[PDB]
Paper text:
The program of herbicide development described herein aims to identify inhibitors of imidazoleglycerolphosphate‐dehydratase (IGPD; EC 4.2.1.19), an enzyme of histidine biosynthesis in plants and microorganisms. This enzyme catalyzes the manganese(II)‐dependent dehydration of (2R,3S)‐2,3‐dihydroxy‐3‐(1H‐imidazol‐5‐yl)propyl dihydrogen phosphate (2R,3S‐IGP) to 3‐(1H‐Imidazol‐4‐yl)‐2‐oxopropyl dihydrogen phosphate (IAP).4 IGPD shows strict enantioselectivity for its substrate, with the other three diastereoisomers of IGP acting as competitive inhibitors of the enzyme, thus indicating that the active site shows some flexibility to accommodate inverted chiral centers. Previous studies have shown that IGPD is inhibited by triazolylphosphonates, whose potency is based on mimicking key reaction intermediates. In this paper we describe work on the lead compound, 2‐hydroxy‐3‐(1,2,4‐triazol‐1‐yl) propylphosphonate (C348) and present a series of structures of IGPD, from Arabidopsis thaliana, complexed with a synthetic racemate of C348 and with the enantiopure compounds.
Significantly, the mirror‐image packing of the two enantiomers of C348 in IGPD2 gives rise to equipotency and, as in d/l‐AOPP superinhibitors of phenylalanine ammonia‐lyase, the mimicry of a reaction intermediate gives rise to potent inhibition. This study adds to the ever‐growing body of evidence that certain enzymes are chirally promiscuous and that mirror‐image packing of ligands is a more common feature than is generally recognized in the field of drug development.
Numbering used by the authors:
A (entry chain A), B (entry chain B), C (entry chain C), D (entry chain A), E (entry chain B), F (entry chain C): 1 to 176
The structure:
């Protein structure tokens, strides 16, 4: 999946062994966590002007890539509760075709490179590209890196469950 | 399972392909959700005088029907965390033989047909008929329909887990 | 544009002389306002189970209908400030391909048939179907009908501006 | 229009196709937005010592360039209300010959490169170079980039209106 | 349009080149502003006993004169956002045939001759004579003269829009 | 696993049919719960001077016993949400090699033999002996016995998941 604008140029290829190299070492780490806990190899390359555009557009392109990869009938729902030392983060996903994100974190000890702005824009991008409902709810924690990385691990774990093949269309209304 | 009083007359048949028709369109939708996420066909028909009596007595009868269908040795415990757009609802069930319900929701945007009274009385009815401990804990949300429907989806998912056969009596005291 | 689920069956036909008949007299009035201030005839018909499903699905279908009718190059942005007696409501739209809604109203004098739940679900449906950013911000007011009707008038007026043909792709990133 | 001090050297040429290259990627993006929504090509080049000096002196030089470009009789007033996802920003301009700026924003989620100091100094610079009254009033929002970029888009849109030719001197006192 | 009582005698002639002379220098200035931003010449002369009676009765007579001059089918709605140095004032008009005024200002630095009483009574008079809904909402400001003059400029600008000819009766109910 | 100091002498033998006899009937019950929900037989015997030393040292010894039994590649993460009547307790474990415990309970109705001191010291002992991150987070509840027993049931259930064999080293850093 490739997405190109005048701001960013992003390639996300799920199922291909390859590097994750976005030219942002924080995002590279977060995406490495995401892919590891999703349980899939992926190749991700990006160029960008501003980090916000990178994080958001990575989210969009990753979402679109996940959507393209979905089986016809998929499990739809997946959750994860992820600890990382002091951090404890609930991640809940519904591949609902109703884009929505709610990211509720409370970072006490900030860390350079980790920003709520960037986390939120990645998650909104992902929600919009995948066309999904995504909740990130911090239950405990203080450290920025532990909170944000737990969220990315959790997204991977939750989507591992939600993107699995199902025997039915998982909606009482008969369509998503 | 049939339960008849001077107020209501209710039939719940689990495992039978059939209609869910209670003469309350909101409850029909909630029960459709419940059954879908439980993963069982059911036929439910009711007549009633007042909606409270309907919701409670449906809970009792459904609980009794679930209890009748349990294997001798069952998993006992099941949880679900269910998102619906803004709503995020935790449902926790223990088929404990200790009737108890705790329903903790916070509806900001009310909706006609959706009432905490009716939800609580359905859940207490279910707890009493099944003979179970049931928690409904809203983690996030504003919209009445999203919150209540998430609760019914969650009850279905949780009971899907809790009602499966187990290799042992699931209690250290040796009996339920 | 026809959209059909097990819950609702909706037709929205923009540019066609016809009636607006949803089987909800409040919504019929709101949509009549919307269409009048948009400056287009439309035919709308619906069947539904529950009013929430109606309001949301009308939003979705109307949004998709507006998206289908959008010129290749469109103005993208449109605003309205709409008074109705005590009410004064700001509506701001960006046809951004970034679904988002923020509805901030404060109804002091409630009115049967008018609910924040239903307004919010219509607007989120519209945002998701059109793929747009939509703000509704009450500046003044107390009366439910005045506030909500002002919002619908304002959506029509704002979308009248935003859906007009433009000479260019209205984004510095080169893509919408 | 060129302005040179011991701190900065800035060229702003309105109506010339060219690059916007200030050696600050955030400002380049903001100025690209400004020019796009103004509806004019411009060439902007700068060297600078400190970013504050750049932002302020860009504002001054851009203001002077806009002032030089004004027709004899101009519309004087222009407004914009600009959404960007969560952000909603009102921009109001009066080319009054009374330099004044009031920038009222509330950034909840900060972003590296985006600072209220720099926004305010650009706007004051612009107000002083153009000789104008400028209000930036955040109505909604949390994200720094969305708020600041909406302000720059809004300045462009507002000045598009205010700098258009008029049939009269737009003041009851007979002069500006 | 002439209106005579035992308290005041007022002539308002729209479209006539002429003096604005009410024997109140503050009101003469405000009305000069109003007429300038409306974009019409007018002749206004008054005698009065008390300033309140003047301001109110000028509003009534001006409203009646505007009403008399309306085309059969008129635009109905008009808004303005007007800055004046520190002041930023929103004016919203609906020629609704439902008299109503809401004037919400917050003057920090008072000025002799400028009073909320007089502004409010002019606006209510105008609403009653024209038969219109009028909102004046201060968004920012401290100085009495800047706030009140912005309101009069804004009323002129808003009514410039609202009083233009339209192709239709601008109401879904088919009549005003 | 035998651990002997001048204060305590503890045997924990996982996978062995035997009794749990610590000379503290509360701890015997808690450990019976832990083992049952872990899904393992175990033999535990202890002598001790002071109950704190017992609870802590049981934690340490049990943790070391679990660590000894861990497969080379293990699942690492496990969670449980456990109801017991009024109580609802979240337990989250990461076998991280980063000892940490956070126990957040709120006992309203105290019970002899049940103490936050002792619970916390058992959990910290377990965290240190296993070399793990352990969160215990009360979501609801009042009764001391229900809260504490839910925590022990939850630890068993969570560790059942976390101690299972995996196909890989469960860390992006390549080392645990
Ligand atoms: O789409 P699904 O499968 O979640 C079922 C819908 O009834 C949910 N819903 C969303 N808004 C009101 N109800
Ligand atoms: O009945 P179970 O299997 O949950 C085991 C009991 O010890 C629980 N309990 C209830 N009250 C005090 N303890
Ligand atoms: O897409 P457009 O036209 O609004 C231009 C983007 O730079 C906006 N943006 C959104 N998030 C950060 N920047
Ligand atoms: O200069 P203009 O056209 O806005 C008209 C002036 O009367 C405004 N003003 C500024 N301070 C007091 N009055
Ligand atoms: O008169 P219009 O054109 O604004 C349309 C009316 O429905 C408005 N309204 C006033 N009160 C309740 N509704
Ligand atoms: O050790 P793991 O597998 O959890 C991966 C690490 O990056 C986590 N981490 C801990 N502190 C900062 N990052
Ligand atoms: Mn963004
Ligand atoms: Mn890390
Ligand atoms: Mn009852
Ligand atoms: Mn529903
Ligand atoms: Mn909905
Ligand atoms: Mn109406
Ligand atoms: Mn400065
Ligand atoms: Mn941007
Ligand atoms: Mn009076
Ligand atoms: Mn003046
Ligand atoms: Mn100790
Ligand atoms: Mn017990």
């Amino acid at each position: 999946m490739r997405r190109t604008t005048k701001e960013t140029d992003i390639i996300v290829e799920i199922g291909k062994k390859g590097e994750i190299k976005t030219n942002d070492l924080i995002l590279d780490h977060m995406l490495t966590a995401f892919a590891f806990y999703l349980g899939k190899d992926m190749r991700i390359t990006a160029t960008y002007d501003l980090r916000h555009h990178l994080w958001e557009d990575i989210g969009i392109t990753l979402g679109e890539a996940l959507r393209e990869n979905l089986p016809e009938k998929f499990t739809r729902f997946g959750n994860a509760i992820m600890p990382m030392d002091d951090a404890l983060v609930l991640v809940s996903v519904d591949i609902s075709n109703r884009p929505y994100a709610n990211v509720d974190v409370n970072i006490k000890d900030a860390e350079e490179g980790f920003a709520v702005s960037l986390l939120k824009e990645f998650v909104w991008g992902l929600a919009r590209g995948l066309r999904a409902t995504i909740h990130i709810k911090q239950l405990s924690g203080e450290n920025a890196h532990h909170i944000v990385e737990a969220a990315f691990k959790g997204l991977g774990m939750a989507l591992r469950v939600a993107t699995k093949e199902s025997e039915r269309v998982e909606s009482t209304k008969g369509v998503l």
